[PDB]
Amino acid sequence: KAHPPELKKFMDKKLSLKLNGGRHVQGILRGFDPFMNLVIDECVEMATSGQQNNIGMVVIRGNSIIMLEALERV
Amino acid sequence: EMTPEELQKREEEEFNTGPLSVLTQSVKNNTQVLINCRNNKKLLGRVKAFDRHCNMVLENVKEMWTEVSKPVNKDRYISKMFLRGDSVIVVLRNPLIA
Amino acid sequence: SSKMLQHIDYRMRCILQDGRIFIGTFKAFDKHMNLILCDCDEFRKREEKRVLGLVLLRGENLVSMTVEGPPPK
Amino acid sequence: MVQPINLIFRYLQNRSRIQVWLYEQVNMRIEGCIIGFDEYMNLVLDDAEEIHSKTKSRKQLGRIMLKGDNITLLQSV
Amino acid sequence: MEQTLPVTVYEMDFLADLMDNSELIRNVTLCGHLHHGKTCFVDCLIEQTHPEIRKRYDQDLCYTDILFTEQERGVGIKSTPVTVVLPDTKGKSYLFNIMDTPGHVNFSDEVTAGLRISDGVVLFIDAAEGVMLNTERLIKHAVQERLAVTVCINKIDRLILELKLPPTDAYYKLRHIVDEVNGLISMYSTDENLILSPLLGNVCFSSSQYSICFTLGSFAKIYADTFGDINYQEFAKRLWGDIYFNPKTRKFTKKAPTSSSQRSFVEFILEPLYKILAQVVGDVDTSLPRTLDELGIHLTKEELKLNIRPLLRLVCKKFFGEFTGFVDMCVQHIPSPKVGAKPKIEHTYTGGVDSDLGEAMSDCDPDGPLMCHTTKMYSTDDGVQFHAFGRVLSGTIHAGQPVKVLGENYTLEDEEDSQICTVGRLWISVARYHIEVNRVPAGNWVLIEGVDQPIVKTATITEPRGNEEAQIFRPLKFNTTSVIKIAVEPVNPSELPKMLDGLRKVNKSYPSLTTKVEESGEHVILGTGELYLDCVMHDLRKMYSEIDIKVADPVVTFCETVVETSSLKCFAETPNKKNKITMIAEPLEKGLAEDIENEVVQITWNRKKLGEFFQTKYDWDLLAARSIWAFGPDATGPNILVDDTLPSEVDKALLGSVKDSIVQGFQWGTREGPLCDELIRNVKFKILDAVVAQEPLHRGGGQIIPTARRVVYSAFLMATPRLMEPYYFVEVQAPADCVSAVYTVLARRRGHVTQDAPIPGSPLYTIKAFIPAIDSFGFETDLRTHTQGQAFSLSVFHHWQIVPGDPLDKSIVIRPLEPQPAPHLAREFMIKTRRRKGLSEDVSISKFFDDP
Amino acid sequence: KYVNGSTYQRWQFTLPMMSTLYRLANQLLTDLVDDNYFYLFDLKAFFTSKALNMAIPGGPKFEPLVRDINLQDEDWNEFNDINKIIIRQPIRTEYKIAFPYLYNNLPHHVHLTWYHTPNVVFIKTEDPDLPAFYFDPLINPISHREPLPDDDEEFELPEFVEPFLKDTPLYTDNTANGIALLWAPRPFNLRSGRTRRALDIPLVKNWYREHCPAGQPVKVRVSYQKLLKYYVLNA
Amino acid sequence: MSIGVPIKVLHEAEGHIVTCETNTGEVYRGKLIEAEDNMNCQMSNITVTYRDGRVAQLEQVYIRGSKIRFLILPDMLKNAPMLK
RNA sequence: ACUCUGGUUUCUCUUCAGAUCGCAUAAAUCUUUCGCACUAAAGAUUUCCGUGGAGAGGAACAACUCUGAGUCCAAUUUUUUGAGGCCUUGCUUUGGCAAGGCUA
Ligand SMILES: Nc1nc2c(ncn2[C@@H]2O[C@H](COP(=O)(O)OP(=O)(O)OP(=O)(O)O)[C@@H](O)[C@H]2O)c(=O)[nH]1
Numbered sequence A: 001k002a003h004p005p006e007l008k009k010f011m012d013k014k015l016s017l018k019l020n021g022g023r024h025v026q027g028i029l030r031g032f033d034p035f036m037n038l039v040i041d042e043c044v045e046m047a048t049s050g051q052q053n054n055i056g057m058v059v060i061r062g063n064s065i066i067m068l069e070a071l072e073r074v
Numbered sequence B: 001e002m003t004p005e006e007l008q009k010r011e012e013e014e015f016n017t018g019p020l021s022v023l024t025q026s027v028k029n030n031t032q033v034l035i036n037c038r039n040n041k042k043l044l045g046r047v048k049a050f051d052r053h054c055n056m057v058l059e060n061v062k063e064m065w066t067e068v069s070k071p072v073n074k075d076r077y078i079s080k081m082f083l084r085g086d087s088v089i090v091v092l093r094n095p096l097i098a
Numbered sequence C: 001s002s003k004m005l006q007h008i009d010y011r012m013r014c015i016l017q018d019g020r021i022f023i024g025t026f027k028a029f030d031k032h033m034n035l036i037l038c039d040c041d042e043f044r045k046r047e048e049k050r051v052l053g054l055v056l057l058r059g060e061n062l063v064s065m066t067v068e069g070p071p072p073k
Numbered sequence D: 001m002v003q004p005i006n007l008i009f010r011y012l013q014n015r016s017r018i019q020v021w022l023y024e025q026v027n028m029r030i031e032g033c034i035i036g037f038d039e040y041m042n043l044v045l046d047d048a049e050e051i052h053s054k055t056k057s058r059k060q061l062g063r064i065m066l067k068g069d070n071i072t073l074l075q076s077v
Numbered sequence E: 001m002e003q004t005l006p007v008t009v010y011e012m013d014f015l016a017d018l019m020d021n022s023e024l025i026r027n028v029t030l031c032g033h034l035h036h037g038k039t040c041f042v043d044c045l046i047e048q049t050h051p052e053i054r055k056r057y058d059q060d061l062c063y064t065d066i067l068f069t070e071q072e073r074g075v076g077i078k079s080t081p082v083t084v085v086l087p088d089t090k091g092k093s094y095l096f097n098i099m100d101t102p103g104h105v106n107f108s109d110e111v112t113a114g115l116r117i118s119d120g121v122v123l124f125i126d127a128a129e130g131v132m133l134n135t136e137r138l139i140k141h142a143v144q145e146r147l148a149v150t151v152c153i154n155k156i157d158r159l160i161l162e163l164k165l166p167p168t169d170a171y172y173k174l175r176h177i178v179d180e181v182n183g184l185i186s187m188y189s190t191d192e193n194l195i196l197s198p199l200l201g202n203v204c205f206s207s208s209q210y211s212i213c214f215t216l217g218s219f220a221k222i223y224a225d226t227f228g229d230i231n232y233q234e235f236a237k238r239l240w241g242d243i244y245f246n247p248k249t250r251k252f253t254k255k256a257p258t259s260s261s262q263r264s265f266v267e268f269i270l271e272p273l274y275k276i277l278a279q280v281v282g283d284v285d286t287s288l289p290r291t292l293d294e295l296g297i298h299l300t301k302e303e304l305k306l307n308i309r310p311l312l313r314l315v316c317k318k319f320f321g322e323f324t325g326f327v328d329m330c331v332q333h334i335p336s337p338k339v340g341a342k343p344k345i346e347h348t349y350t351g352g353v354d355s356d357l358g359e360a361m362s363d364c365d366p367d368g369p370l371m372c373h374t375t376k377m378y379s380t381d382d383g384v385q386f387h388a389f390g391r392v393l394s395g396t397i398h399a400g401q402p403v404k405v406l407g408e409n410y411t412l413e414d415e416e417d418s419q420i421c422t423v424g425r426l427w428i429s430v431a432r433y434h435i436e437v438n439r440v441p442a443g444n445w446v447l448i449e450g451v452d453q454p455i456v457k458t459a460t461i462t463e464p465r466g467n468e469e470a471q472i473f474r475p476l477k478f479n480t481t482s483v484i485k486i487a488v489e490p491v492n493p494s495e496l497p498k499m500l501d502g503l504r505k506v507n508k509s510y511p512s513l514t515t516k517v518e519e520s521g522e523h524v525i526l527g528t529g530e531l532y533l534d535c536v537m538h539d540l541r542k543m544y545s546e547i548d549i550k551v552a553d554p555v556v557t558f559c560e561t562v563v564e565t566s567s568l569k570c571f572a573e574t575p576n577k578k579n580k581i582t583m584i585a586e587p588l589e590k591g592l593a594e595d596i597e598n599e600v601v602q603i604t605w606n607r608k609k610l611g612e613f614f615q616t617k618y619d620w621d622l623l624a625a626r627s628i629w630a631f632g633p634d635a636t637g638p639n640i641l642v643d644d645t646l647p648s649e650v651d652k653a654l655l656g657s658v659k660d661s662i663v664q665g666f667q668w669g670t671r672e673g674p675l676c677d678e679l680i681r682n683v684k685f686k687i688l689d690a691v692v693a694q695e696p697l698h699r700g701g702g703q704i705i706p707t708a709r710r711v712v713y714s715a716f717l718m719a720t721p722r723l724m725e726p727y728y729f730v731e732v733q734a735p736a737d738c739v740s741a742v743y744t745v746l747a748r749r750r751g752h753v754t755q756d757a758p759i760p761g762s763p764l765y766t767i768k769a770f771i772p773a774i775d776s777f778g779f780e781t782d783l784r785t786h787t788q789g790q791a792f793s794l795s796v797f798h799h800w801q802i803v804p805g806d807p808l809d810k811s812i813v814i815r816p817l818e819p820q821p822a823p824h825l826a827r828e829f830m831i832k833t834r835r836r837k838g839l840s841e842d843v844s845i846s847k848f849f850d851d852p
Numbered sequence F: 001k002y003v004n005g006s007t008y009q010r011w012q013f014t015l016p017m018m019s020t021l022y023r024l025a026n027q028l029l030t031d032l033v034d035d036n037y038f039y040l041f042d043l044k045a046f047f048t049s050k051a052l053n054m055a056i057p058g059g060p061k062f063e064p065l066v067r068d069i070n071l072q073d074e075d076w077n078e079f080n081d082i083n084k085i086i087i088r089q090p091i092r093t094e095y096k097i098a099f100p101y102l103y104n105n106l107p108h109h110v111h112l113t114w115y116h117t118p119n120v121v122f123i124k125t126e127d128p129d130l131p132a133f134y135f136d137p138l139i140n141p142i143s144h145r146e147p148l149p150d151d152d153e154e155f156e157l158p159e160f161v162e163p164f165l166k167d168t169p170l171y172t173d174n175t176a177n178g179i180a181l182l183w184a185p186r187p188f189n190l191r192s193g194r195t196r197r198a199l200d201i202p203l204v205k206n207w208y209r210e211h212c213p214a215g216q217p218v219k220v221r222v223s224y225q226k227l228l229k230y231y232v233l234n235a
Numbered sequence G: 001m002s003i004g005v006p007i008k009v010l011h012e013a014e015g016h017i018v019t020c021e022t023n024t025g026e027v028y029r030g031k032l033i034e035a036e037d038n039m040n041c042q043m044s045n046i047t048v049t050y051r052d053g054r055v056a057q058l059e060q061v062y063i064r065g066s067k068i069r070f071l072i073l074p075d076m077l078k079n080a081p082m083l084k
Numbered sequence H: 001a002c003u004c005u006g007g008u009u010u011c012u013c014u015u016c017a018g019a020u021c022g023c024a025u026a027a028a029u030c031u032u033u034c035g036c037a038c039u040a041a042a043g044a045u046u047u048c049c050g051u052g053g054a055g056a057g058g059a060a061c062a063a064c065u066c067u068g069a070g071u072c073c074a075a076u077u078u079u080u081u082g083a084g085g086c087c088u089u090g091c092u093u094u095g096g097c098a099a100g101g102c103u104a
């Protein structure tokens, strides 16, 4: 009965994820599941050390996701 | 689940062959059990019954927990307890000394 | 589950998982123990009272409910 | 549009250098060669290794079954 | 608060709190054709939101139609606003300001008064009758007033219980209806982003007799509450439109499996609806309880004893439940009005969106400068005091708060049509009760007490001591033209003031009513038809003035046109004997009067785009096309004033010195006209030459306005003048056998049948015809009597056509009380109007010259 | 099961019983599916015509309710100037009943008739061997000719699900009969009712309430009009 | 029988200004656009108070409902029909 | 899924009923209007034919269908855990709290 999180507003958008342990990440959304695990293109890591770390396509478990901010205008 | 059957006793095939079978042992052997539980405590007792959430009824328990002073280990004896089973780290049949 | 339908509109005190206190008029609940409390005042420790309003407390962070006062008129 | 477990299947099809983050453990991440997933995102890694951030002593683990309830983020290299 | 309101499902504190959040408000006009289900749909929404307000078993509660003439005629006459709080499919309650508008085409003006204060439209379509006259006209008027258009295909039970169509063929009927509405919207709008399909949620299916109402999402949610694991929005994306269901792969395919499978709409929606209606009406006693048990409906033993129509209404009230598909449709597809504030200000505000107040009205904020706009005046049933009804577009009206009402003639330089009125009380107007409120924030509709005195039709209420640069909203551009003209006198002349009082009151009640006094002291009411003027006359004799009133015969207003250019170039000097104006009048090009009237051109354009239009569309030189001064009697009227004065012969600055007064005299001349003092139409007035006096106290004003009217009149009369007849477009809905009877009725009344086309999926035909409006008096009575009620006609104004006579023909003798033949009808129509007007017996072409 | 009891006060009937009673009473009923037939021929129309001292052609004729305005006693005002009046068609009696406030000076005690009710397009079923839901040839044909989701999309309908009444037949052997009972005259549109006296049931009241048929002699026509006269005086 | 009353009040809070506290102590006040059965709140025009006291302006926010400690809804919804 | 109401029919009485009390329609009387009153209209009253509801009383057989009430879920998203341990200050109600940094 697990409905998907309502995120076609946020598809192909530049979002900054907040992750669990005070962590942060940035990237383009590419999809989801009903469990809100997000797949991300052009992922820049953006740690608290201050230097920005690009990766690319990553997958983030939805358990660890605190918030999405759409940095791009939806 | 691909086993939606009404006559579900696979959960004690779980308790004879699987990982939780270690405690049906102490349902039947009446053996002393050491439980490392989440607040850095130890619960030694004898589990009378339990099932799949690992919630256990334990009888005649000595519980250990240590305090800082730098750590001295204190004890308290409790008659008999229900223990909610997500509040465990590990469960241990106490070993064969002989 | 009438054990908390017994407590609707009673002014209840909800101790939370961080230790914060929600003294609010218990309006509604569900199977996940999400509470709807109206005119809810938060009590934290140094004492101060912080009025919030209609709090939708998610059930994950609720520890213990207890009555503070009878339901108002 | 990519769904995540399809990209996990593409990761094992690529046998990439998958670095997996941890829930609540921001120091230690784990490199690995991903082989298998399931319904609940448990991951087996062939040459997995612990990387701290203060220590940064990469310890080799072998093929692990990292539980789904512990991972945060599957990046590559 | 403080009033005794009926028992309702919501509570009025929640309605007053949804009033503040203007994201949860839907200003909706329920508009459609006559008897297409709108009032019964509002009845269904009222029965949903009011548990004590229930429809009687054998007779439909209307709950709008609160007038006595509405309850006796059965035709909705005035728009009744209903403010309910309706829950959505997700359970979310939205405030709904619903305008139940009359679907009769004569009362189309009333729909316009609802279309102005609405952000959206639900177009109600009989599923049996399909798209009719007023559904096309309100598609046109709804996409032309920049409104979001949704469709409720009401009366789908007529597909089941009357036509007894197969479910595949009734799907074809509903699909044809949706395709017809899509074709009409693509006709009247260049945009194709407003495609109406039930897959989008734009189309709702309904039966307001039996309280069926579903979109695809709300019917899919019945499956989602019956079977748990299904997500209903993805299902609703598959339910309509040549998508078949494969029950072996459990998947919806575009390719049909089995060569006899049905569409998803027929299988999952229409066949359950047919089986519900067929098990109720056919097999109540035998097999209704087992299918009711299959649907999850249990009815009491008292409830199964009902007759078949109340039992149908009850069974579908329990199956479909609340009308959450209507709320789905109007929430997804009708703006916010926060979102809908900007097209509303761009379309209906005179300053436009780019003003400093147009910006603050696009924000729609309740803590803004007050910019209420009232389009309707609702009389209380004592008749004395009116209440102005409209929407607050910014700010907040307050009861007891003094306020500045601006009438329709208020410009920012003519600030005298304003008046500072104290707002007496504010009501949130549901139909049979009013919720008295202390304030009304922006986006909401409001009945206002105390602002009724300085306004006749349409007001902009602002605040005093601020908003000094506050302009009016545009007056209601109506769908049609009030053409039918009745003279009205009291039986006892001593109670003339009561009648005059009552005349003012019907001028407030009916938005396209024109009450004037002609030069003979004859009081004249203009209306759109005979039902419209019958209700106006009922309200005049019974509601407002309690006196006895003689009516004359209904006559029409004529227009005046020319057919060739003027014989001699006409001239007029002022009483100064300076300032000669020299005009000719020639007929306009074909379709140009339709372009000026339907705002295809504006004088509000710059000279470049206007000249480019007239060059690329009607073969004008850019010499002539850059020389257009004005546009007929109003800013959008069917005449043109051009100056063909060369700058060699005339000083162009000295001509622009008196351009305003020549334009004013031309507009007044085309407003009255020299044949019968009725509007000049389709005439190009070319100023050929203009002597202008040098010093400004010798030109201007009292000299050049009547001189310009005299040269407009003489240029008109020297061109060969013709009268114009209003022609009514008549849509007749007859049976297949009564078509030759409709032809016979129309042949006695100069009516030309345009078409007789079968209503596809109904056993009826539509005969579209063109009757003259002077020949339409008792035409619908002739038709429905001759066909024994089987044929029914609605007639609305279409165009003006030249009367077959010649009005300036003294050779024609007219015996006074005879129906004249066609080839001198214009001579009958000109002089009797001239007698009615009271002017002279005949107009000579030399009456406005200077030689005699 | 079918009546109240021995007092014979309330009846409740099965819809096959009401269908076959409707078929047995077919000769006494006009098979009108509307009251559009009684346009300017209903009670309100006749109350209006009695109030205006006007006679609808198929209808009754009374004494004047008010003393008439003699149109040779009114004295040529500017209002009733016959040189101002454009005559196209004679303004009939029917137009002054149809729109009593437009076409009458002094409409007193006058009744606004019901306007159009929408044309009940009910196709009577000649053949019971025909399906109850059937595209009858009285119905004009629908000449055939969409944001559809792709078939590659993974929307599945779940196993428990199918349409709501898939086991139920679309029509039964008494579905068209019940649909015909929806458009049946009173008392045949009922399935429960209160028992009436045999005095109280006029078997032929809805016969003179129709228009008198074509080709009738003058005495039956005046009989129709005088039956209507005492019907209207009763009501 | 299926969906509870507080999620109905959360759906009733859409369009209004709600202030949601999350698990990491961050308080998000702004216009709740959409909310689901799980408390995933797409909100907009967000004033954010972090744990330190800093206030940021984040114009489009989607909070996962697992991490929500509580939401403070408007008191208008004290008169909402599902709270009766 | 266990228990206590209420029934239905018929006969009669009493009272209310401007509700199509009647999906039917009479008669009398009075007043008014015109004719010049079965062949005529209005208004009002009354009587009849004979209703619905409520209340009450009798007597016939049904007694728990109905209307109600009392009476299968440990794997992300809530209820089968990221939990527990270290450091500085403000006050210590010398138990320790609050904030932040951590470590796992
Ligand atoms: N068969 C059928 N008839 C309906 C349905 N809905 C309404 N009607 C009938 O159709 C007639 C339409 O009347 P209304 O709906 O009240 O009028 P309207 O549609 O608002 O149009 P206006 O008269 O202009 O106000 C009514 O007599 C209803 O009894 C329907 O769903 N099915």
Ligand SMILES: [Mg+2]
Pocket (backbone or CB within 6 Å): E038, E039, E065, E075, E076, E100, E101, E102, E103
């Ligand atoms: Mg209506």
